[PDB]
Amino acid sequence: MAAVKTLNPKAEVARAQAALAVNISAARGLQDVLRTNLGPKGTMKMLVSGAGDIKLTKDGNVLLHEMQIQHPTASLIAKVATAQDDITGDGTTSNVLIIGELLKQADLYISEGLHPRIITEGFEAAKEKALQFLEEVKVSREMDRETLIDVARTSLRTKVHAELADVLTEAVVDSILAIKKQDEPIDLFMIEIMEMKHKSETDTSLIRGLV
Amino acid sequence: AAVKTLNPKAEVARAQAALAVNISAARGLQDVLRTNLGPKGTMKMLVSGAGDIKLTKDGNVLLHEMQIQHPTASLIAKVATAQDDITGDGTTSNVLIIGELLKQADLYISEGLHPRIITEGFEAAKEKALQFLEEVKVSREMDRETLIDVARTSLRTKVHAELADVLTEAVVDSILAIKKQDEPIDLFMIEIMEMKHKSETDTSLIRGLVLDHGARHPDMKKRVEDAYILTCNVSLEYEKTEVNSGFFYKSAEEREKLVKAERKFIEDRVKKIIELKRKVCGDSDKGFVVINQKGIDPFSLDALSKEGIVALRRAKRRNMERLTLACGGVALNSFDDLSPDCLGHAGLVYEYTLGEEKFTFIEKCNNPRSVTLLIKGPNKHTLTQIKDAVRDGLRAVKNAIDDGCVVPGAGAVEVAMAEALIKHKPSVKGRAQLGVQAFADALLIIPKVLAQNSGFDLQETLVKIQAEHSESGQLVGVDLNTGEPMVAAEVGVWDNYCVKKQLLHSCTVIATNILLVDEIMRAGM
Amino acid sequence: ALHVPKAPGFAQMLKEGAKHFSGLEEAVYRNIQACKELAQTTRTAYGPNGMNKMVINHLEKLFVTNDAATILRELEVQHPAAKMIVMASHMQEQEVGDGTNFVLVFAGALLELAEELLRIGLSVSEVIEGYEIACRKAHEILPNLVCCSAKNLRDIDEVSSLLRTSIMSKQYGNEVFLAKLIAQACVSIFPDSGHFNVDNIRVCKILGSGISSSSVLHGMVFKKETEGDVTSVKDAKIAVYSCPFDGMITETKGTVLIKTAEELMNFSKGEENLMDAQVKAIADTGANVVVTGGKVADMALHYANKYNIMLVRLNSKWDLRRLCKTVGATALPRLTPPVLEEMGHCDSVYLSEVGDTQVVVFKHEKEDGAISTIVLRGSTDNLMDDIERAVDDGVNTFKVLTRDKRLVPGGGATEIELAKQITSYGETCPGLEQYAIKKFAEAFEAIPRALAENSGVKANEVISKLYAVHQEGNKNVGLDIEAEVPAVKDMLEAGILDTYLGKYWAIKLATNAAVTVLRVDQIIMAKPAGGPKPPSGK
Amino acid sequence: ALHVPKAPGFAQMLKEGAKHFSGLEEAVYRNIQACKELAQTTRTAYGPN
Amino acid sequence: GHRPVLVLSQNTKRESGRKVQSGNINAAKTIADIIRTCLGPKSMMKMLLDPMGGIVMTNDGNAILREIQVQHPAAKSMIEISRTQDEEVGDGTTSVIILAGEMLSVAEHFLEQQMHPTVVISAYRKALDDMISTLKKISIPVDISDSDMMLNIINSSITTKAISRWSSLACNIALDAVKMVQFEENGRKEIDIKKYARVEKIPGGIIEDSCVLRGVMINKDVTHPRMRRYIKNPRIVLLDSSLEYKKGESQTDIEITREEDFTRILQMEEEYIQQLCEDIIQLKPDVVITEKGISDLAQHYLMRANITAIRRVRKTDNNRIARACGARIVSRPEELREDDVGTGAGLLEIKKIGDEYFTFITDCKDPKACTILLRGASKEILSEVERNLQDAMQVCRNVLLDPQLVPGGGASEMAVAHALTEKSKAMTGVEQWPYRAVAQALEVIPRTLIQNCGASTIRLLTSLRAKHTQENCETWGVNGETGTLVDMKELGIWEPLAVKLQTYKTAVETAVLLLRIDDIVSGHKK
Amino acid sequence: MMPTPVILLKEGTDSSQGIPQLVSNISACQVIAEAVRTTLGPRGMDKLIVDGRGKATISNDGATILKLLDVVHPAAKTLVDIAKSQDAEVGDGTTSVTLLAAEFLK
Ligand SMILES: Nc1ncnc2c1ncn2[C@@H]1O[C@H](COP(=O)(O)OP(=O)(O)O)[C@@H](O)[C@H]1O
Ligand SMILES: Nc1ncnc2c1ncn2[C@@H]1O[C@H](COP(=O)(O)OP(=O)(O)O)[C@@H](O)[C@H]1O
Numbered sequence A: 001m002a003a004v005k006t007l008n009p010k011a012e013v014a015r016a017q018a019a020l021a022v023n024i025s026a027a028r029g030l031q032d033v034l035r036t037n038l039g040p041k042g043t044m045k046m047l048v049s050g051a052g053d054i055k056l057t058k059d060g061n062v063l064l065h066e067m068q069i070q071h072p073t074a075s076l077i078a079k080v081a082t083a084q085d086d087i088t089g090d091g092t093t094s095n096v097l098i099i100g101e102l103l104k105q106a107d108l109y110i111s112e113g114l115h116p117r118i119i120t121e122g123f124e125a126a127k128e129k130a131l132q133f134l135e136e137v138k139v140s141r142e143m144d145r146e147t148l149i150d151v152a153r154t155s156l157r158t159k160v161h162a163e164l165a166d167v168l169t170e171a172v173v174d175s176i177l178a179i180k181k182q183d184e185p186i187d188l189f190m191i192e193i194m195e196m197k198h199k200s201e202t203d204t205s206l207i208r209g210l211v
Numbered sequence B: 001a002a003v004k005t006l007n008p009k010a011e012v013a014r015a016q017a018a019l020a021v022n023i024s025a026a027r028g029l030q031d032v033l034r035t036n037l038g039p040k041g042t043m044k045m046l047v048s049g050a051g052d053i054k055l056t057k058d059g060n061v062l063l064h065e066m067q068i069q070h071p072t073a074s075l076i077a078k079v080a081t082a083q084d085d086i087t088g089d090g091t092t093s094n095v096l097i098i099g100e101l102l103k104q105a106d107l108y109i110s111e112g113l114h115p116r117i118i119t120e121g122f123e124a125a126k127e128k129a130l131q132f133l134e135e136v137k138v139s140r141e142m143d144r145e146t147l148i149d150v151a152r153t154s155l156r157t158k159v160h161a162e163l164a165d166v167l168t169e170a171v172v173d174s175i176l177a178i179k180k181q182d183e184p185i186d187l188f189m190i191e192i193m194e195m196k197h198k199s200e201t202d203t204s205l206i207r208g209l210v211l212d213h214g215a216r217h218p219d220m221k222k223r224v225e226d227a228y229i230l231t232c233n234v235s236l237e238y239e240k241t242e243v244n245s246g247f248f249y250k251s252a253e254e255r256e257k258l259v260k261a262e263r264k265f266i267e268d269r270v271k272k273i274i275e276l277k278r279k280v281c282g283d284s285d286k287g288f289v290v291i292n293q294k295g296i297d298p299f300s301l302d303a304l305s306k307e308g309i310v311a312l313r314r315a316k317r318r319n320m321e322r323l324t325l326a327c328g329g330v331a332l333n334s335f336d337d338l339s340p341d342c343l344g345h346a347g348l349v350y351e352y353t354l355g356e357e358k359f360t361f362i363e364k365c366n367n368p369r370s371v372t373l374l375i376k377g378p379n380k381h382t383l384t385q386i387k388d389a390v391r392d393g394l395r396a397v398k399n400a401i402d403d404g405c406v407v408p409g410a411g412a413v414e415v416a417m418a419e420a421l422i423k424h425k426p427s428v429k430g431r432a433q434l435g436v437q438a439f440a441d442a443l444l445i446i447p448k449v450l451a452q453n454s455g456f457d458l459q460e461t462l463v464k465i466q467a468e469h470s471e472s473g474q475l476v477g478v479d480l481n482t483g484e485p486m487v488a489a490e491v492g493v494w495d496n497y498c499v500k501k502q503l504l505h506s507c508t509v510i511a512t513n514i515l516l517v518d519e520i521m522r523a524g525m
Numbered sequence C: 001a002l003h004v005p006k007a008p009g010f011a012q013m014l015k016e017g018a019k020h021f022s023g024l025e026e027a028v029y030r031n032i033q034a035c036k037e038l039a040q041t042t043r044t045a046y047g048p049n050g051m052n053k054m055v056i057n058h059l060e061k062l063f064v065t066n067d068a069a070t071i072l073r074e075l076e077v078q079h080p081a082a083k084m085i086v087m088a089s090h091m092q093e094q095e096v097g098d099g100t101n102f103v104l105v106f107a108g109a110l111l112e113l114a115e116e117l118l119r120i121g122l123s124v125s126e127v128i129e130g131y132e133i134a135c136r137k138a139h140e141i142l143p144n145l146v147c148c149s150a151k152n153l154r155d156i157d158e159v160s161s162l163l164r165t166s167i168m169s170k171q172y173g174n175e176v177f178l179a180k181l182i183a184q185a186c187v188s189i190f191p192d193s194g195h196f197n198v199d200n201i202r203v204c205k206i207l208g209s210g211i212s213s214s215s216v217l218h219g220m221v222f223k224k225e226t227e228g229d230v231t232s233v234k235d236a237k238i239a240v241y242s243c244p245f246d247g248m249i250t251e252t253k254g255t256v257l258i259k260t261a262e263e264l265m266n267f268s269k270g271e272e273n274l275m276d277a278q279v280k281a282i283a284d285t286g287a288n289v290v291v292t293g294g295k296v297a298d299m300a301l302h303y304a305n306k307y308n309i310m311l312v313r314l315n316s317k318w319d320l321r322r323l324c325k326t327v328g329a330t331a332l333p334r335l336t337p338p339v340l341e342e343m344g345h346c347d348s349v350y351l352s353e354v355g356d357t358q359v360v361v362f363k364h365e366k367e368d369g370a371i372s373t374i375v376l377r378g379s380t381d382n383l384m385d386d387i388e389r390a391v392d393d394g395v396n397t398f399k400v401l402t403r404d405k406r407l408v409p410g411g412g413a414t415e416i417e418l419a420k421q422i423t424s425y426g427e428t429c430p431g432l433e434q435y436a437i438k439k440f441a442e443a444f445e446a447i448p449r450a451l452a453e454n455s456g457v458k459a460n461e462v463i464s465k466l467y468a469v470h471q472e473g474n475k476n477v478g479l480d481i482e483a484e485v486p487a488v489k490d491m492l493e494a495g496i497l498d499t500y501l502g503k504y505w506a507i508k509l510a511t512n513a514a515v516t517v518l519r520v521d522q523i524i525m526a527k528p529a530g531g532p533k534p535p536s537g538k
Numbered sequence D: 001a002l003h004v005p006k007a008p009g010f011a012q013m014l015k016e017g018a019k020h021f022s023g024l025e026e027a028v029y030r031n032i033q034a035c036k037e038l039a040q041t042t043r044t045a046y047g048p049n
Numbered sequence E: 001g002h003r004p005v006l007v008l009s010q011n012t013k014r015e016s017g018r019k020v021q022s023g024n025i026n027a028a029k030t031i032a033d034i035i036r037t038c039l040g041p042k043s044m045m046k047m048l049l050d051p052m053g054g055i056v057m058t059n060d061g062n063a064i065l066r067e068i069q070v071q072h073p074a075a076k077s078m079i080e081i082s083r084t085q086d087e088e089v090g091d092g093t094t095s096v097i098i099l100a101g102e103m104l105s106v107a108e109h110f111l112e113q114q115m116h117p118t119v120v121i122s123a124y125r126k127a128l129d130d131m132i133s134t135l136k137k138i139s140i141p142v143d144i145s146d147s148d149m150m151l152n153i154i155n156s157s158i159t160t161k162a163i164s165r166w167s168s169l170a171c172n173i174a175l176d177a178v179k180m181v182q183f184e185e186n187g188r189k190e191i192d193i194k195k196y197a198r199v200e201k202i203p204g205g206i207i208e209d210s211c212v213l214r215g216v217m218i219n220k221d222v223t224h225p226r227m228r229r230y231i232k233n234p235r236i237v238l239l240d241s242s243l244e245y246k247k248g249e250s251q252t253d254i255e256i257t258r259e260e261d262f263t264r265i266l267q268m269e270e271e272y273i274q275q276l277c278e279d280i281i282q283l284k285p286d287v288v289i290t291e292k293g294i295s296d297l298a299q300h301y302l303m304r305a306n307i308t309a310i311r312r313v314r315k316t317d318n319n320r321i322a323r324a325c326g327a328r329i330v331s332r333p334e335e336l337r338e339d340d341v342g343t344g345a346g347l348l349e350i351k352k353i354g355d356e357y358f359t360f361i362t363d364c365k366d367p368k369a370c371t372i373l374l375r376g377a378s379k380e381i382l383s384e385v386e387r388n389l390q391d392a393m394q395v396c397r398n399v400l401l402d403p404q405l406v407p408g409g410g411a412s413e414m415a416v417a418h419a420l421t422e423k424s425k426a427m428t429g430v431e432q433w434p435y436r437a438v439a440q441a442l443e444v445i446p447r448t449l450i451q452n453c454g455a456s457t458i459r460l461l462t463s464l465r466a467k468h469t470q471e472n473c474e475t476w477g478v479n480g481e482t483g484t485l486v487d488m489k490e491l492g493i494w495e496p497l498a499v500k501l502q503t504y505k506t507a508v509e510t511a512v513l514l515l516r517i518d519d520i521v522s523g524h525k526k
Numbered sequence F: 001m002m003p004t005p006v007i008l009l010k011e012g013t014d015s016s017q018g019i020p021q022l023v024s025n026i027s028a029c030q031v032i033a034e035a036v037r038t039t040l041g042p043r044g045m046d047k048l049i050v051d052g053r054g055k056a057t058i059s060n061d062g063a064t065i066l067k068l069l070d071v072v073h074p075a076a077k078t079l080v081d082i083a084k085s086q087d088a089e090v091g092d093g094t095t096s097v098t099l100l101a102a103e104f105l106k
């Protein structure tokens, strides 16, 4: 049928609306799996490797890595989330959700015959305006201990339950304040993370030293 | 899953998976059948496993010949089959509206809304839509011009423009010929015959009968001018007794006597026919034609042809009624007592031989109440396409006659119904307003697809038409040539009121039942 | 990241072996390519210089020919678009008799030019509309190109001259001889009534003596032999029966019930006496040749030999009816003696051997009769079949001439004139349809181009010369195949003429086929089935 | 009408040998049943007897 | 050689003990969970895929259960009890399955707690007797002459189906059909709706046009086109014997030795047919209906007397016509008495629906059989409509035979559970614990209704239970739509006592049957 | 060649066209003539053909030898046909016809 299959008979080609359908279906599937991750009230997932290793996770990037998926569009989304996690370290589930919803909303108008290029132009204009608004709405403030505690709570409560998050907040905030030098970049390599397997999960703490 | 726990080889989809599967199947069907809608649609090639080629545009035919193995596709196909069998038109619109209803409902269900609310909205919107359809119908006397307009609106969508122009006249004339006052129209009294020797535009209407068989005796007359028609259902060939008799003789002379005697039963009936022929016409100017549902053996054929009688054997079962209505005789099951008043009359009977097969024409009847349509063309697939087109056209004209009214076409009624539903939406209490909005948007699929097939853009054309309808209030549809809104009534684009009503009812019912399904199981093994 | 899944929707609900093509590239261009392939396949066998083709069908029967319809029939064509073009060619063959290759070539050229027009930007609807307008213009123009009429069909010489062009495309070397044979056969048939039956010309193929030894016989020839001692009659009074030449029996059940010795003794004697009486009654009417359609009894044959009656048995009821038509007899359903008004007469009936085949000849002497027979000779069965096809084309040409007596110049003169006039008309037509009209006119060049290609000359020079002469005003000048260089000559003086109905129907059918192929936008092919063939085709 | 296709989205993208159990009954109750079975397996070896 | 020696045959697996009981109870629980979500007025439909290629889009419990195939024998027992409940009373099929599953669930606890199953079974039987007594106590009488009340009962019966949108029309159709099928001869009351209330589904049209006919409609047509397709007040003659010339039973042969015997025999065939038709005509009928063929000559001799004939009619259709028009099927027309002629039909019209001919014997006066003409979207929609109409007709028959009513919407379950608990309070033996367990296991129905509605199960059920502890609160249940407690005296949801009684009996006996079982043995041949 | 998603003729069809086809035809006719070449003249020899069933056919007649050779080459079958034709019409010269035809072609 297609020119490629004429040249290479054993070739898989999805053209025209088929490409959009495939990509949007994959994005919606990833979004449907990762919807339940968002927020502190999200549900936990138990991921079992081939070897039988049990891994409980709620992180978006970890879940993306350990879903048995073989889709190209899912691979692109996973690469984007990997970069997001590598640079910023938080926001992967939101990344996947926003990509999926953007594609769904765009398809809502594309299915009415609208060319995708117009949608992309609208996307760029909206992104510029949204960035301006985000610049306007940010709260510039010298960050003492309590603000950092609030930020750490906002992250860790989404990752673990209440009391564990409460312990981890003090631990991480105090560690960062200890290793940080005034008006210098922070080297996260100086916070060693060591594992022991003998007490309860609430016994994790910070050692003003080394282990 | 529970079913897989009980039956290991069980295929089950549950909860949102059921809705996803059903809506995906409906969307696929809609995507395929989008291009059929409207006169500007695209024809499809259908090649069977044996290699038969069938060009088509009909929704039901295409649905039958799509290579599909989906459950939701089976349900939609059954709905379309029922629609086609009763009304005869609107299957493509049926599939489109079902699919778009499902899509619009999913547009809200994806936001965590339960399908039951959407179905309640569907029901309220359907009730309001039926009220509006009752309001908007055009109760007009079904003169020839209106029937011609309806026939155009159907056939132009099915076939080429010029072929449609011919078929309109043929179909309308045939329906008017076979229709008696205040009596239901019997479409069985229109015969559709195939000739494969001329151009497609040579299809015409014969005010009589065309029979796919002719006289089997070479000495019979090939053309009879003034004919007496005798429609009989009597066997004129040797028939054994029911008691398993056999013969018993003792010499060759006895054998000859028994050979001559065993034919007397059929010879008496042939003699009755010949005596009647001699009585009614003592001159050779008139003619006598015998049409028989049962066979005629060669001896009877020779005996009849020696008297200048044309005899046709093994006629169709319905041809008895058709000849009775057209020529005007009486169909006899026996020659116990026949009189000249049991003879039909035809002003011309002649035989047309095409290739190996043979045809017989019975024309120039007095006032035939049963006529025939002669489909002509150069290919088999052309003949099949014309047959489907004339079936659609005849159904359209019959529906237009049966209903005292008619509905403006071109999607104008869809736009008006959508706006009426939007206006009625505040009256609905609760969250069923979302279902009402979904129903209105789904109804709006017809003008969208019409503009899409015509080559224009859906959004701009639709908003232009909607603005025009809101401003003026007239029933404005889609002009497939320019894209501008046009008054469908003024330009004579007519739909069928019954077709629209059945569309609303069937589409809403099937969409409601499909939406509420939350599990597909295959565990009968 | 390793596979491209099937798109959601229709692409996933498709069956296992089904195929779906849609849009321009996947469907329309592929259809046009298939039709172009088919046209190119049959192109080389066009015109007098067309080269024969050996085709082996699936049954290993060997066909050698240059008739386009036969080649397409014996070819296992599988593409649906090519199938439709083949249907158009077969319809042309059925309706007219000749011009199938014209239909194929014209449809192929039309579809190629349609592909070109679509590629440069035109829409399918515009192409179809332009082709339809141009076809109507061509049909209007064609009557004005008529050069001469038949004006007589009972004259052997003129009829042979008319048929020479038809049967010179096939069997180029020896067309005068076959023209004379077919002209004699057709003039014997075609009585004062204007109706001419093609089925009344019979061809008997007897192998051995080269096709120059063929002849036409005013009668019928059957490849069998007599059944009695008598093998020749000079004043035949044939009586024809459809019943077996035996004592008729009861249709229900026959049982000879014997209750005494005398009945047992007398039964066979009575049966023999009755058979002798029946045969003697037949013979006393004057009949000396008896033709029966069924089994011949031994006692009946004995008594036929006794009374010097020639017995001929014909299995085919078609042959029986043809013999009745030829002689002028009526098939009696019983063994009753024939009355004088239904006993056929033939001027000579005899058993003869031609080659090494025994044949029974029902020979007249008058230049009349309902049925004539052309006994072909030759050295190969395939060659004789080819000659039979040529005879069929000639008879169909005669039938067309009886239906319509107008003729148009051949050799591509008519095609060039039509192309020139349609191009001139299209130049005056504004709108986007002018491109389609001009392409339709240009597609007519495919006929002289194929003729020149087959004759071995440069097609371009021939077409340029044809335009030059036609612009000069000579509308009857076509390709001269009797030259080693591109040259033209007047067809009216030469005598190459084509029937008006032939060109009319050929153009109509080719245009319809091309338009119908163009109209297809999507293709849904079911998975092919390897069953025991469809029951409809037996 | 003789086969139930896999739902579009995550159901199709799953690998061949993988299994995805989601929801209350399909995951929580199965886990509880497995743990109860293990406890019943080791129950009889409890206590001096 | 030395092939292995063993007592029982190979492929004969045997398992026994506690794990067998656990497997049985889990099989029953899984069968319950299959259709747990299809109970209540807000149930969701299921799309069953027939093995032959059909589709059954349904909501009825028995249809879903009978369309699936299982290998565990306890599941087979549950399917069987579903079929039993469907056949015996007509509905309650998806409730008895849920009840049986819950009863086995609460029995598993005691089985694991060292209780012998015979004790649990004794407690179950005592509990079942007490439930029957309590249901008989709390029921209320109904007068069958009150048409409005009967319609309301049918409405409460089919409000949980897919026909609730046309509930009014459906109730009227079912009630009228059952009332006109009700027959009584020789002092024998009879409501036989499976034979004499036929449902005919013709697709297309709209479901608002479906109606019950005062007669019978069959998919037939006149044998000969000259016969009338419209007779005002026909006299109908019903036959179950051919009007042709057939062979006799004895081996008969004829020996024709004369010339005229063959033609004479054929003429005798014709004369015999003529005499038969003359005997038919002697009663002066208007239409003649036969289950066997009618020869062409017979058609001619009938039309000479202006008679319509229908050629081949199935046996059941003929019985329905005989009941409707007051005819009497006869075999030999020579014995055709006057009383066998069917007068009472007020019209015989043979019209065209779609592209087929349908014969109508409607407009009868006092017919004892009828056909229900269902016209709708397609085949599957009409099949579901037919199932719902069958449910409605069964409920109507049950009410007509037994005029007792009990509150619905879980009110009966809660009332019986409360009464059973109060009675168990006086029990002193060890059997009281399973007695209670099944008493409060009866509460699964209101819980399932609340779950299907989408409301909060725990607080609504607790409030309902607290309400039922008061005195005059036996009629308090839940709304399947709003998910709130409501008195059934004002909601109007009531159901026949027979249906609830059969449901409780079948559930308890299924639990009893599966609790007695141990040591599954399989693999043996016949 | 290109795959051509839907192929024109039936899959497995064999076609030969052009001068090479004609040359191969001439060569096949030469091969058929060679099989009966030595059976001409008063010094001609016999041939012995064994069929599948084991029967032997010893003959000098050209037509007989050609018939007993189950030739299937479409161009070579013409020589067998003309040998049969010469046998039918004349009865002699069945060897001369094949030699003459093959020599014309050569
Ligand atoms: N000439 C026209 N101009 C505008 N609209 C038209 C015209 N002809 C038909 N239509 C509209 O297009 C639709 C054609 O649908 P059709 O192809 O007939 O589907 P179906 O055959 O399934 O009814 C009709 O609803 C009709 O109102
Ligand atoms: N002597 C000739 N010179 C030039 N052209 C000729 C001559 N004889 C025949 N033709 C042309 O050959 C064409 C016939 O080709 P043919 O193989 O018969 O195709 P078809 O069988 O489809 O008609 C005619 O159009 C005719 O004009």
Ligand SMILES: Nc1ncnc2c1ncn2[C@@H]1O[C@H](COP(=O)(O)OP(=O)(O)O)[C@@H](O)[C@H]1O
Pocket: E038, E039, E040, E041, E043, E060, E061, E091, E092, E093, E094, E095, E096, E156, E157, E159, E160, E407, E408, E409, E410, E445, E449, E478, E479, E480, E481, E493, E495
């Ligand atoms: N409006 C209503 N509100 C709450 N419960 C209802 C309502 N109508 C019926 N019910 C309950 O629903 C049950 C009927 O559900 P149904 O699906 O018919 O079960 P079954 O198939 O077993 O008869 C009855 O027990 C009845 O008490």
Ligand SMILES: [Mg+2]
Pocket: A090, A091, A155, A158
């Ligand atoms: Mg985070």
Ligand SMILES: [Mg+2]
Pocket: B089, B090, B154, B157, B392
């Ligand atoms: Mg239509």
Ligand SMILES: [Mg+2]
Pocket: C098, C099, C100, C166, C169
């Ligand atoms: Mg030709």
Ligand SMILES: [Mg+2]
Pocket: E091, E092, E157, E160, E391
């Ligand atoms: Mg119920």
Ligand SMILES: [Mg+2]
Pocket: F092, F093
């Ligand atoms: Mg010699």
